Amino acid sequence: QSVAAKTLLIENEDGKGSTRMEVQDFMKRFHMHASEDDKTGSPSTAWGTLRFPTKEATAPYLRLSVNDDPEDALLFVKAMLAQKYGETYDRPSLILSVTGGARNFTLPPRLETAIAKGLRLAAQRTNAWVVTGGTNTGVMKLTGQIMEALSKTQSHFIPPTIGIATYGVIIGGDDMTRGEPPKIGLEYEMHKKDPPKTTPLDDNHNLFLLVDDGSTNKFGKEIKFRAAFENAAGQAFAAPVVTIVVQGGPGTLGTALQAVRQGTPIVVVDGSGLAADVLAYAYNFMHNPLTRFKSYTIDDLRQKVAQTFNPKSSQQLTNLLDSALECVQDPNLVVVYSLQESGIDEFDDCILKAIFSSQGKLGNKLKQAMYFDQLDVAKRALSEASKNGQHNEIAACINDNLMAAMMHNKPHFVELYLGFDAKIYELKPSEEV
C-alpha cells in the first residue's frame, strides 16, 4: 500500500538547502520526441518506478530527450535520493562510470573475482555512484551481479547503480508509454515479446534514464548525454569521475576518446576482451619500458584493430587507429590493469593511481587516498611533495585533510597528518560561524 509522492525536495542553485515543490511542476521541464523530427517536442509524462521480479526495492525511471539539460536530470536523481533517504544522505565522493561490451563475454574467473572485489570495495568505501548502460547483457549485467551483493550486505544506504540507456531499444516501451504520469508500481516483463525491439532492461540497476531522440532500434544516441551528466554531477559534488573500460566495441572507443578529451581518466582492464586489449597494446607500445614489449609495431596493431572492429574502408581503419592513438596520447589519463603484472587486490590501487594522476590539487588526492584506506600512497605523496619544495600546499591542505580524517573515522591517517607539522589547536571550521 505505497502512497504516491505529491511533493519533492529539489536542491537550490546556491547549493544551500532544498525547497519543497510539487512533482508535476518539476517534471513539466522534461521533453519527449515521438516525431523523429519534432525537434522541440512535447512533455514526457513517462516517469515513475519499475518493479522487477525477485527484487524487494523498486527502481525509478525517467524518459527524457537528448537535447535536455543534464542538470535537470541530476536534480531528479538528487531529489529522489533526498526523498528516500532524507536530506543528509551520503554524498558521492567518486563517480565510477563503467563502459564496455554490450554483447556477452567469458572473462577468466580470477579476473572476474579481482574486478568484482575492486569495484565493490571502491564503491562501498566511497559510497560511489556507478553509471553504466541499462541493457541486461554484458558489462551492465556483470556490474549488476557485483552490486547485487552490495544490495544484500548493506541495510541503510545503497549507492545508486544508475543506468542510462537510449530509448527506442527497450522491451516494453509501449507498456511504459501508456498510462498516467504518477506511475508507481509497474510490472516489467523482460520475457514479453516485442516486434521491432529486442533489448530488455537489466533488473539490478537502481535508477534508469531513457534518452530519447525519436529513432527506433538505433544505438549510440545516449553516449554524449551520459558524458555530460557525469561531468555535471562531477562539478556538483566536486568529486572525480573515473570510467573503466571492459572489452568493448567501436562506441566504447568513442566513449573513451570523449572521456580523455574532457580530462576524465580511464582505467582499461588488460586481458578483458577486445577493445580493452587494443588500448593495452597501444599503451604498452607507446609508454611501457619493460623488455618483453620491445617487439611492438603499428602493423600488428592495425591488423588487430582490423580483426576486431572490421571497418568497411581503409580510411575508416586509419581513423579508428588514429583515434586509438589519440586516446593514449596523455599517459596520466590512462591506467591499465593487467592480471599478470599486478596483484589480485590491486584494482582499487589502479583506480587510485588514475585519481592521483588526474587530480590537480594535493588535498583532493589526499582525501581520496584517505577514503580508499591507502596510507602508503598518501605517505609517499606527502614525502615527495615535502622533498620537492611544495611545503606551502601541504600546510594549506593539512587542516582540511585532518578534519576529514576525523569525520570519516581514520585514526591512522590522523597520526600521519599530525606527524607532518600540523598543530591540533590550529583547526578551522569549514563554514563561518
Binding site: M286, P289, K294, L321, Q329
Partner: protein
C-alpha cells in the same frame, strides 16, 4: 606520391578551389582542362608588412631578393626551378597545380620560405633507460596544437626578410614552446640552441598553397642527447597555438601538412624509429 590539397581554402569563408584528380597534379603533365579560381584572402589583400605586393612585376625569382634592403629567400628547392608567367608576371608554383591562382592565404608570391623548429629528446623512463621500439631508439618532439584548424603540428613560421634560420628557429621556439621566454634555464636553453642542423629543405604540402604562392619549408632539429636542457623547459602554449606538448614520433601520426616527411628526415638523420 603526388599531393593534392583540399578544395576549400582555410579561413576564406567557404571559397573553393578547382578540383583535380591525383593523376593530373604534376607540372610535367599537360592537363588542358585546368581552370583555377582566382581568390585572394582579405588579410592578404589588406597589404601587411610581411606580405609581398599584389602586382608581382619587376621582382626576380630563383635568387635571394632584397626587399627594403633586407634579403628574402625567393629561391625554391624544386630542381626544375620557378617559371614566370608571361601574361601577368606572377611566378608559377613548381610543386604542382593547386586549383587556385592568386596568392591566397600565403603572403609572398612564389616560394614562401618557412622555418620549422623540431626540438627533440629521447623518450626515457624514470629509471633512466631509453625506450626502445622495433629495434630503433624512439624520439619525442614538442608539437603545438594550432589555433586555426585544431590539428597538431611542428612549431614554426615564415622566415622574415634579412634573417636566417637560426634566429627564426630560436624566435619561433621561444614564442611557441616557451611563450614568454632565466638564469640557469637560459644557459641550458642557450646550450640547446647552439647546436642546430638543417635536416631538410622541402616543399610543404600545405592546403593554403596556390599556383602563384606555395610553401617551402626548412626543418631545423634541436636534439637533447643527455636530456638535461629539455627537462628545464616550462611548456606553455602561446600566440597562434592553443596547447603544446611532447609527442612520440611514429609513422602513424596524423599531423598538419607534410610534417611527417620532416620528422622522417629527423629520424632518418638520427637513426630513430619511424
Amino acid at each position: 606520391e603526388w599531393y593534392v590539397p583540399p578544395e576549400e581554402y582555410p579561413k576564406s569563408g567557404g571559397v573553393k578551389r578547382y578540383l583535380i584528380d591525383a593523376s593530373m597534379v604534376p607540372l610535367s603533365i599537360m592537363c588542358p582542362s585546368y581552370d583555377p579560381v582566382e581568390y585572394t584572402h582579405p588579410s592578404v589583400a589588406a597589404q601587411p608588412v610581411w606580405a609581398d605586393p599584389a602586382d608581382p612585376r619587376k621582382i626576380k625569382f630563383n635568387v635571394k631578393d632584397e626587399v627594403n634592403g633586407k634579403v628574402v629567400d625567393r629561391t625554391s628547392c624544386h630542381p626544375s626551378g620557378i617559371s614566370i608567367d608571361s601574361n601577368t608576371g606572377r611566378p608559377i608554383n613548381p610543386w604542382g597545380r593547386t586549383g587556385m591562382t592568386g596568392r591566397g592565404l600565403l603572403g609572398k608570391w612564389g616560394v614562401n620560405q618557412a622555418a620549422d623548429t623540431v626540438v627533440t629528446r629521447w623518450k626515457r623512463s624514470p629509471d633512466g633507460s631509453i625506450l626502445e621500439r622495433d629495434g630503433k631508439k624512439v624520439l619525442e618532439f614538442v608539437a603545438i596544437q594550432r589555433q586555426d584548424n585544431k590539428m597538431w603540428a611542428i612549431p614554426g613560421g615564415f622566415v622574415d626578410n634579412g634573417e636566417d634560420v637560426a634566429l627564426t628557429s630560436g624566435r619561433e621556439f621561444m614564442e611557441e614552446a616557451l611563450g614568454m621566454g632565466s638564469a640557469e634555464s637560459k644557459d641550458s636553453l642557450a646550450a640547446l640552441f647552439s647546436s642546430g642542423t638543417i635536416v631538410a629543405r622541402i616543399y610543404c604540402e600545405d592546403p593554403r598553397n596556390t599556383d602563384n604562392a606555395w610553401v617551402e619549408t626548412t626543418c631545423v632539429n634541436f636534439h637533447d642527447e643527455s636530456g638535461r636542457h629539455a627537462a628545464r623547459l616550462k611548456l606553455q602554449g602561446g600566440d597562434d597555438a592553443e596547447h603544446a606538448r611532447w609527442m612520440m614520433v611514429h609513422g602513424g601520426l596524423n599531423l598538419f601538412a607534410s610534417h611527417r616527411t620532416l620528422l622522417q628526415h629527423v629520424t632518418s638523420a638520427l637513426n630513430a624509429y619511424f
